[PDB]
């Protein structure tokens, strides 16, 4: 008995450290704080992440996640990672409106709602004066910070929300620099939304400053994440359950109690896994 063509049909741990299981949510939903994932904000450290092949609750408001697969990878292998209130709703947007903004696109039970980890700044009365809040990475680790730019469909929409057509956003740090122009243009409804909204994200070195400047269209961060990278993992797309068990190899079909050289099961694998080819017998 010195080869392997079998899988346990489960998803076990790795270094006795269980997977992060996202349920019906995908990564974006999970990080942005999609309402339909509220049950997995408290996820504390893990080996490898598990999407399902039909995990459709993600970016409930339409538009692009920029460098999604880059952010996917960044989050896959992760040791000890922790959410905190980067720009508190209490004290950070004093002269912009901090609750007027929710949408029919992002609902938690028949009620207009919006992402947990972000907050959609709308104008306060007649003016959206420049904001310019900044965050210092006083945490001694990669702080992951995400935000949104909103792209309304009408020019009237703009006034309604952000007042100023001469609207921009800027994001800046010791590693990131971009000005965002709102591209305002009529579109086919998606989720009753002619408008769109793109989601971006950046990592901030410890010690480093990151600053948001905007005259409009900014979807500011509220909750960010202090994280420590790990390596030697990815994201696996399965339907088979998790169990309370140990292993040193994992695949979408199942786990591999392996000491031995190759496998016939699945090519994408996690950790101390044989190469894919076809390996069953040795007389």
């Amino acid at each position, epitope marked *: 008995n010195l080869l392997e063509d079998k899988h346990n049909g489960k998803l076990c741990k790795l270094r006795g450290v269980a997977p992060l299981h996202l349920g019906k949510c995908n990564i974006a939903g999970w990080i942005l704080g999609n309402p339909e994932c509220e049950s997995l904000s408290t996820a504390s450290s893990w080996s490898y992440i598990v999407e399902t092949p039909s995990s459709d609750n993600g970016t409930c408001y339409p538009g692009d996640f920029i460098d999604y697969e880059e952010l996917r990878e960044q989050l896959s292998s992760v040791s000890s990672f922790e959410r905190f209130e980067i720009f508190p709703k209490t004290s950070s947007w*004093p*002269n912009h409106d901090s609750n007027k903004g929710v949408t029919a696109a992002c609902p938690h039970a028949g009620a207009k709602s919006f992402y947990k980890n972000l907050i959609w700044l709308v104008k306060k009365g007649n003016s959206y*004066p*420049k*904001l*310019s*809040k*900044s965050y*210092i990475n006083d945490k001694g680790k990669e702080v992951l910070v995400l935000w949104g730019i909103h792209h309304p469909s009408t020019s009237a929409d703009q006034q309604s929300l952000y007042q100023n057509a001469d609207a921009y956003v*800027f994001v*800046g*740090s*010791s*590693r990131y*620099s971009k*000005k965002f122009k709102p591209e305002i243009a009529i579109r086919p409804k998606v989720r009753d939304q002619e408008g769109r909204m793109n989601y971006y994200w950046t990592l901030v070195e410890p010690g*480093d*400053k990151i*600053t948001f*400047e905007a005259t409009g269209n900014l979807v500011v961060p509220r909750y960010a994440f202090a994280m420590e990278r790990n390596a030697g993992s990815g994201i696996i797309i399965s339907d088979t359950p998790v169990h309370d068990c140990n292993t040193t190899c994992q695949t979408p079909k199942g786990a591999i109690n392996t000491s031995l050289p190759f496998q016939n099961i699945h090519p994408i694998t996690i950790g101390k896994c044989p190469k894919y080819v076809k390996s069953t017998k040795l007389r």
Partner: antibody
Amino acid sequence: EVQLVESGGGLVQPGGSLRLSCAASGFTIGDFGIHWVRQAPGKGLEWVAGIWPFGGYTYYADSVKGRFTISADTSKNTAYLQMNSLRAEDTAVYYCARFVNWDGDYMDYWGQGTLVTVSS
Amino acid sequence: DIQMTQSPSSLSASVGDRVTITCRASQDVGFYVAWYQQKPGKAPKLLISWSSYLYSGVPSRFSGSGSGTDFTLTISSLQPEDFATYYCQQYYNYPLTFGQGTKVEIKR
């Protein structure tokens, strides 16, 4: 019209005391914050004082610690640099400038300057 | 804290010409840099926000660049009005530091 008209500077006896106001036509005060940058002729600009009103906070440069103090009347649109124990290094053109990020911003508008002269 | 070394300390160049003014920060700031033109006597004026982005005046020839430790302000087609003095500011941290200035002289 954005405005930072600065008034009340002049000659004074060393080891002395002059208040120097920076008032604002057009816009409010608290949501912004004001910086005092002065300019001893020929050197180039040097930042000395800063205030965030809505926040309530103030911070100072090494070189004017404990002497100068920034206040600001919400009722009058104005901010004030109280300059104690003046010197010949403080003889200068003092500028107040408009500012937003208390973590560090740039200068949207400056006033025009006030001249402070302090020796013999 | 931080200091903003300029180069040259003053410059002669005829109209039409590419004036270049470089500025070396003492700490790795990042894009937290502004450029100021100040016509002597009067109060300074903002050219570039955030390292590159032309401020909304009428400054079309003035244009920022750089990153990290060194930033550069170019002037592509110089004028009789660009005689003034030019400073790089930082706002990475306090105390907020400027350079000494660069005095661009017009030849004619």
